[PDB]
Amino acid sequence: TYLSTKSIEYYLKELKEIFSQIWLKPSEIEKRCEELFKRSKEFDYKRILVSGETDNTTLYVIEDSSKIHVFSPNRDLRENPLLMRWHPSWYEIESKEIYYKCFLSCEELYEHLELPTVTLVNLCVIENFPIPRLNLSTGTLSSYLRKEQLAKVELIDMQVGTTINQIIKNLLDSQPDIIGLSVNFGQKKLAFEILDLIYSHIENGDLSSIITVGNVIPSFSPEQFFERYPSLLICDKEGEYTLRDLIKMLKKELKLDEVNGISYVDESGEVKHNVAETVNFKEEVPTPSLDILGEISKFRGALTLETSRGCDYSRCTFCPRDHKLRSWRPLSVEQTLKQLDDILRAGKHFNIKPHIYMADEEFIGELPNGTEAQRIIDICEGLLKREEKIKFDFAARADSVYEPKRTKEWNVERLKMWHYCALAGADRIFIGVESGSNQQLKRYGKGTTSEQNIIALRLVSALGINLRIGFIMFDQLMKGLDNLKENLDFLERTDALMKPIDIGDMTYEELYDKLLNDKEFIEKHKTGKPVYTIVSYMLASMEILMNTPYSRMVQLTERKEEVNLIMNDGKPDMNMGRYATSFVDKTNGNLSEACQMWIDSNFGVMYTIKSLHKVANPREKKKLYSYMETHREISHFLLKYLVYNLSPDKESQIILSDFLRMHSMEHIINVGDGSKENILNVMTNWQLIMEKLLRDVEADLNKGIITDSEDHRLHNTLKRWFSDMGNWSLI
**Parent domain of 124:** 117-273
DSSP 451-516: HHHHHHHHHHHHTT-EEEEEE--B-TT--SSHHHHHHHHHHH-SSS-BPPP--TTS-HHHHHHHHH
Residue 591's alpha-carbon distances to 14, 478, 731, in angstroms, are: 68, 12, 14
The length of the chain is 731
DSSP-derived secondary structure letter, 292: H
Classified as helix, coil or strand, 685 is helix
Contact residues for 662 (Cβ-Cβ < 8 A; gap 6+):
none
Name which of 306, 426, 424 is nearest 361 in CA terms: 306
Q: How far is Cα 426 from Cα 419, in angstroms, rounded to an integer?
A: 9
Q: How far is Cα 727 from Cα 206, in angstroms, rounded to an integer?
A: 56
Strand partners, 191: none
Q: How far is Cα 208 from Cα 165, in angstroms, rounded to an integer?
A: 18
DSSP-derived secondary structure letter, 361: S
Q: How far is Cα 246 from Cα 140, in angstroms, rounded to an integer?
A: 17
Q: How far is Cα 475 from Cα 595, in angstroms, rounded to an integer?
A: 13
Q: How far is Cα 98 from Cα 76, in angstroms, rounded to an integer?
A: 5
C-alpha torsion angle, residues 688, 693, 698, 700 (rounded to 10): 160
Query: Do the Cβ atoms of 436 and 472 come closer than 8 Å?
Result: no
Contact residues for 25 (Cβ-Cβ < 8 A; gap 6+):
291, 294
HEC string of 381-416 equals: HHHHCCCCCCEEEEEECHHHCCCCCCCHHHHHHHHH
For 81-93, letters b (16+ CB in 10 Å) and e give ebbeebeeebbee
Cβ-in-10-Å burial (0-12, 13-18, 19+) of 18 comes to buried
Chain centroid to Cα 80, Å, comes to 33
Stretch (H or E) spanning 655: helix 650-662
Domain harbouring 174, CATH code: 3.40.50.280
Stretch (H or E) spanning 329: strand 329-330
Contact residues for 657 (Cβ-Cβ < 8 A; gap 6+):
666
Q: How far is Cα 588 from Cα 650, in angstroms, rounded to an integer?
A: 22
Query: CA angle 130-391-386, nearest 5°?
Result: 165
Experiment used for this model: X-ray
15 dihedral zone (left: phi>0; alpha: psi -120 to 50; beta)? alpha
Resolution stated for this PDB structure, in Å:
2.6
C-alpha torsion angle, residues 440, 446, 450, 451 (rounded to 10): 170
Cα-flanking dihedrals φ and ψ of residue 415, to 5°?
Answer: -60, -45
Q: How far is Cα 258 from Cα 626, in angstroms, rounded to an integer?
A: 61
HEC string of 574-608 equals: CCCCECCECCCCHHHHHHHHHHHHHHHHHHHHHHH
Stretch (H or E) spanning 450: helix 450-462
Chain centroid to Cα 645, Å, comes to 40
Query: Do the Cβ atoms of 134 and 303 come closer than 8 Å?
Result: yes
Helix locations, 186-332, DSSP H: 188-203, 222-226, 240-250, 281-284, 291-295
Query: Do the Cβ atoms of 64 and 106 come closer than 8 Å?
Result: no
C-alpha torsion angle, residues 60, 62, 65, 69 (rounded to 10): -60
Q: How far is Cα 552 from Cα 556, in angstroms, rounded to an integer?
A: 6
Q: How far is Cα 156 from Cα 121, in angstroms, rounded to an integer?
A: 5
Classified as helix, coil or strand, 217 is coil
Residue 85's alpha-carbon distances to 82, 100, 108, 208, 259, in angstroms, are: 5, 18, 11, 27, 19
For 244-269, letters b (16+ CB in 10 Å) and e give bbbbbbeeeebeeeebbbbbbbeeee
Output the known binding site. 133, 137, 182, 239-240, 306, 311, 316, 319-320, 323-324, 359, 361, 434, 543
Name which of 425, 430, 301 is nearest 361 in CA terms: 430
Q: How far is Cα 707 from Cα 501, in angstroms, rounded to an integer?
A: 38
Output the known binding site for S-adenosyl-L-methionine. 434, 543
Q: How many helices and strands in the chain, by DSSP H and E?
A: 25, 19
Q: How far is Cα 695 from Cα 699, in angstroms, rounded to an integer?
A: 6
Output the known binding site for [4Fe-4S] cluster. 311, 316, 319
Percent helix, strand, coil in the chain, to 5, is: 50, 15, 40
Output the known binding site for cob(II)alamin. 133, 137, 182, 239-240, 306, 320, 323-324, 359, 361
Cα-flanking dihedrals φ and ψ of residue 723, to 5°?
Answer: -70, -35
Query: CA angle 649-654-656, nearest 5°?
Result: 95
Classified as helix, coil or strand, 620 is helix
Strand partners, 391: 355
Cβ-in-10-Å burial (0-12, 13-18, 19+) of 193 comes to exposed
Residue 57's alpha-carbon distances to 53, 60, 139, 287, 444, in angstroms, are: 4, 10, 16, 12, 46
For residue 689, the tally of other CB atoms under 10 A from its CB is 20
Taking every pair of C-alpha atoms in the chain, what is the biggest distance, in angstroms?
100
Query: Do the Cβ atoms of 235 and 213 come closer than 8 Å?
Result: yes
